[PDB]
């Protein structure tokens, strides 16, 4: 087991203590998993953003009988104290903050070295690595679960070509996931990363958000909530029109780059900000990324234009272009996880609840599932949404029998 | 042709002149229909909310070669001057404001008496009456178009039972329809109806919104925009959770009836507010409805509790319950259409663009379509949204081919 500093373990345990007390839906699932022990004898290899709430998810599976081998899905998002606390919990952990690309793929491989039965992934890199380099593990793998939009794109494009070799559950596209995780979760946590790292006033700034899907909406909403003038970029006209009618300025990036004070890319696509955009930017512009991979902002292009790169502050790099400066947060990686604590607890409670139950779904269908992407059933979303609603002290009306009849027969 | 007063026509012509200048997407389609004359020789029977913007759609179809027989789909939403101007334009009009239930169904039948080829309806009343009482018309009918959520519910359950006898295009569920007409359109137009009729200050009121679908969100956001304390009612926990995280109080209607100052029902279901809720309401509570039919508020219950019903102000009825008064706007009909001029022009431009092209789709697919509910293809939404985006002074970026390879390859 390979972690940064085992002496950091107490601080991580405390953070797990705090998180466990604020994830009620997962806490209930855990008690049911403590009995019925669904994962006894199985190995679950996990590649997630290793902080307190992931550690609780891993703990939920461990107490359910599973052996847990886990690594980080991002070189910068791991929290060393939490990882050390995970080893004290009895987990095989290969993760630290700041690992090289070379080291990143070493830790992924070591997780696969444990011969897992279930794969839990965030971005499909663990799943990808199996199909390309480690085909010798496909036999034992019962199935997987994928957390994020970008991972689903790859998995679906794999499945489309017929390259997918074991079932994978689409956890991202569940109603209680992408509607809350991607929107309200990154809405708060991305602004958290920016505010905590920069100590800059959001109000009165031009905040340029690339893309207006679920993540864009969230960031636009919370940035607008803090008094920003929000500008939206898109390639989808239906979604740009939403942004316009939500009160935002819609521009081609070649234009938004001229006036933006803070940039947040949320597209899942590469090269949102490249050479031509950097040359248009104002002195002092601050750059950040909330989409999975670090290639939305072209760092090689930015290094190419620069005469030097200095530390401007913790998690802020200064690129002196000679005539102006541009700041990059968290090396252009997930600004909410590279520069903050990730999504708030109550939102990750729902996402990891779907994750937990999806692993149980994989187990119970050991050999009966197709080599396809499976969608999460609506009742699971209904159950989780209702539990979360109640924990916040709200409730729902219920249709009377007469009302159900009016809505189903046409009289 | 049967209308209230032909002398009112000049006001109708002016209102149509004004709308035509603010419906650019439909204005383009009309010129193509004037050119290609797709409906030459055909009769189109239409049941829509007969105001200035519906008249433009009818005229657009008239210039496309069609004979137009139109009535209102609601007894109160018709504008008499617009109807008069419609007859001066050469349309067969059977509609006036405030028509009785027998008059409403007499006018519905008169439209069908013209033996139409294409049916354009809002709420499935024409399509329903055809299938039940006027079955001899199925032969000549090529197809239909349905405007609203409620109409689609009926049409889908009809088709599910095998009772649908000609194809109907689902105009409501188009992206450029329910995402903007039901949300932004209803958001502004319903609050206009409430504000315009009552002259009451929205800020500081407890506004109880029934339902949190597309119409619910719009009303809630616009009510909040004006400083109301928004309370949401729902039977869908996923959507109730949305409202909670958008900053609203979520309650069962029994608790909400105790504190609500203004009520807006947006459910499409009957009996949202009944006897038991009227007994809980505050003295002076204002009741309003934005769902298609007037049975979301149980008016029979309210009369039974009332010692008298009198005019309190134009479009306001005072129901004196003896110990308190309850006010009802627009006889519990579409508060944005019974008490105002309906959706804003820019929003109906998109909805009526889809209506026009779907009528063209029906004609060109004569005898080829099944007796099923047809969805509007994505390329139609794309074209419409892009056109609408451009007219509002914004534009969209485009992916380079290299960016298009990245989003499709799983490496
Ligand atoms: N904690 C986090 O930081 C977090 C959480 C959830 C998802 N994500 C990642 O964020 C990304 C999107 O999340 P989603 O759920 O919003 O996906 P989504 O697809 O709803 O949002 C994507 C939007 O980007 C737009 N887009 C694509 N290329 C563009 C371009 N070149 N210029 C402008 N706009 C463009 C698309 O039209 C789409 O609207 C994914 O990579 C996902 O993994 C991150
Ligand atoms: N101009 C207008 O006024 C206008 C425009 C569009 C649609 N509409 C009408 O408004 C209604 C809604 O349209 P939509 O597109 O919102 O449909 P939608 O179904 O998305 O919204 C309906 C919501 O009502 C909720 N609901 C149902 N019964 C309920 C109950 N008893 N208590 C609480 N919540 C309940 C459902 O869960 C759903 O979320 C439909 O009747 C539609 O025809 C009116
Ligand atoms: O605090 C967190 N812990 C674990 N996963 C997280 C956290 N915040 C966000 N994500 C998840 O990371 C993915 C993007 O790579 C998203 O799927 C999001 O849900
Ligand atoms: O001003 C208007 N003219 C015509 N139709 C309208 C207007 N406002 C709303 N609707 C339409 O009425 C239906 C609800 O019964 C909805 O489909 C909405 O699009």
Author numbering:
A (entry chain E), B (entry chain A): 22 to 432
Publication passage describing the model:
S-Adenosyl-l-homocysteine hydrolase (SAHH) reversibly cleaves S-adenosyl-l-homocysteine, the product of S-adenosyl-l-methionine-dependent methylation reactions. The conversion of S-adenosyl-l-homocysteine into adenosine and l-homocysteine plays an important role in the regulation of the methyl cycle. SAHH depends on the cofactor nicotinamide adenine dinucleotide in its oxidised form (NAD+), which is self-regenerated during the catalytic cycle. The protein structure of SAHHs features three domains in a monomer, the active form is usually a homotetramer.
Structures of archaeal SAHHs were determined from three organisms: Methanococcus maripaludis (MmaSAHH), Pyrococcus furiosus (PfuSAHH), and Sulfolobus acidocaldarius (SacSAHH). While archaeal enzymes deriving from the Crenarchaeota phylum (SacSAHH and SsoSAHH) show catalytic activity only with SAH, homologues from T. maritima and the euryarchaeal classes of Methanococci and Thermococci (MiSAHH, MjSIHH, PfuSAHH, TkSAHH, and MmaSAHH) show higher catalytic activity with SIH. Regarding the structures of PfuSAHH and MmaSAHH with their preferred substrates inosine or SIH, the oxygen attached to C6 seems to form additional hydrogen bonds with the carbonyl oxygen atoms of Asp348 (PfuSAHH) or Asp362 (MmaSAHH) in the main chains. This suggests that the hypoxanthine ring is in the imino-hydroxy form, although inosine has been shown to be most stable in the amino-oxo form in water. Similarly, our complexes of PfuSAHH and MmaSAHH with inosine and the complex of SacSAHH with adenosine show a closed conformation state of the molecular gate in their active site. The absence of a comparable monovalent cation was observed in all structures of archaeal enzymes. Similarly, MmaSAHH tetramers and SacSAHH tetramers exhibited an average ΔGint value of −133.5 kcal mol−1 and −127.5 kcal mol−1, respectively.
